[PDB]
Write a protein that holds these residues in place. Structure first.
Motif, PDB file in Angstrom:
ATOM      1  N   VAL A  16       0.864  -1.150   0.000  1.00 23.57           N
ATOM      2  CA  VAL A  16       0.000   0.000   0.000  1.00 23.57           C
ATOM      3  C   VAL A  16       0.939   1.250   0.000  1.00 23.57           C
ATOM      4  N   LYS A  17       2.219   1.170   0.516  1.00 21.81           N
ATOM      5  CA  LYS A  17       2.916   2.387   0.660  1.00 21.81           C
ATOM      6  C   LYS A  17       3.842   2.569  -0.512  1.00 21.81           C
ATOM      7  N   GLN A  20       1.061   4.429  -2.271  1.00 20.72           N
ATOM      8  CA  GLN A  20       0.735   5.739  -2.247  1.00 20.72           C
ATOM      9  C   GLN A  20       1.837   6.504  -2.739  1.00 20.72           C
TER      10      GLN A  20
ATOM     11  N   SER B  65      -0.616   0.046  12.124  1.00 20.41           N
ATOM     12  CA  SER B  65      -1.690   0.981  12.287  1.00 20.41           C
ATOM     13  C   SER B  65      -1.229   2.390  12.026  1.00 20.41           C
ATOM     14  CB  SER B  65      -2.281   0.904  13.713  1.00 20.41           C
ATOM     15  N   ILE B  68      -0.784   2.907   8.273  1.00 22.63           N
ATOM     16  CA  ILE B  68      -2.048   2.989   7.584  1.00 22.63           C
ATOM     17  C   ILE B  68      -2.642   4.360   7.804  1.00 22.63           C
ATOM     18  N   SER B  69      -2.545   4.957   9.019  1.00 16.94           N
ATOM     19  CA  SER B  69      -3.083   6.275   9.316  1.00 16.94           C
ATOM     20  C   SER B  69      -2.380   7.264   8.437  1.00 16.94           C
ATOM     21  CB  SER B  69      -2.838   6.735  10.776  1.00 16.94           C
ATOM     22  N   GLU B  70      -1.044   7.152   8.296  1.00 19.12           N
ATOM     23  CA  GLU B  70      -0.300   8.086   7.491  1.00 19.12           C
ATOM     24  C   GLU B  70      -0.816   7.959   6.090  1.00 19.12           C
ATOM     25  N   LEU B  71      -1.045   6.735   5.562  1.00 15.53           N
ATOM     26  CA  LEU B  71      -1.471   6.670   4.180  1.00 15.53           C
ATOM     27  C   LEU B  71      -2.819   7.291   4.034  1.00 15.53           C
ATOM     28  N   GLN B  72      -3.750   7.014   4.975  1.00 12.82           N
ATOM     29  CA  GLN B  72      -5.078   7.544   4.844  1.00 12.82           C
ATOM     30  C   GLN B  72      -5.060   9.031   4.972  1.00 12.82           C
ATOM     31  N   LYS B  73      -4.239   9.610   5.880  1.00 13.80           N
ATOM     32  CA  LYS B  73      -4.190  11.045   6.063  1.00 13.80           C
ATOM     33  C   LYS B  73      -3.683  11.672   4.812  1.00 13.80           C
TER      34      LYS B  73
END
Lengths: 52, 73
Positions: A16-17, A20, B65, B68-73
């Protein structure tokens, strides 16, 4: 039993990273196509007030 | 190979026919090898490890976690 999930969590998280990031720097660049393609629609404001 | 290396030839003073059978009895051989456990403090032992183990699980889960927060933010 939980540890395993943890694993394919780590997995799929840094892919996922890989995501992004990518889409991130992508947006810069689609963004830069927008600063260039703009300066120079004009400097196309020469070429068109000359014709005038 | 190294598994093969330690699991046979027996451990701590554990009987060889029992130790064998934990090997056959083993539900999940790669993830696992038979390890001799020794009365109550040993279970105490295990628990101490479990807790040891618990904290690190919790944490790594936190690391996922956070990412994932960093990606969502």
């Amino acid at each position: 039993e939980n540890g395993e999930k943890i694993t394919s969590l780590h997995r799929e998280v840094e892919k996922v990273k890989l995501d992004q990031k990518r889409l991130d720097q992508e947006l810069d660049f689609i963004l830069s196509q927008q600063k260039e393609l703009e300066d120079l629609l004009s400097p196309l404001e020469e070429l068109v007030k000359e014709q005038s | 190979a190294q598994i093969k290396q330690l699991l046979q030839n027996p451990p701590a003073g554990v009987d060889p026919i029992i130790w064998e059978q934990a090997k056959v009895d083993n539900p999940d051989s790669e993830k696992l090898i038979p390890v001799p456990m020794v009365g109550f403090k040993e279970l105490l032992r295990r628990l101490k490890v479990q807790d040891q183990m618990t904290k690190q699980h919790q944490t790594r889960l936190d690391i996922i976690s956070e990412d994932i927060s960093e990606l969502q933010k």
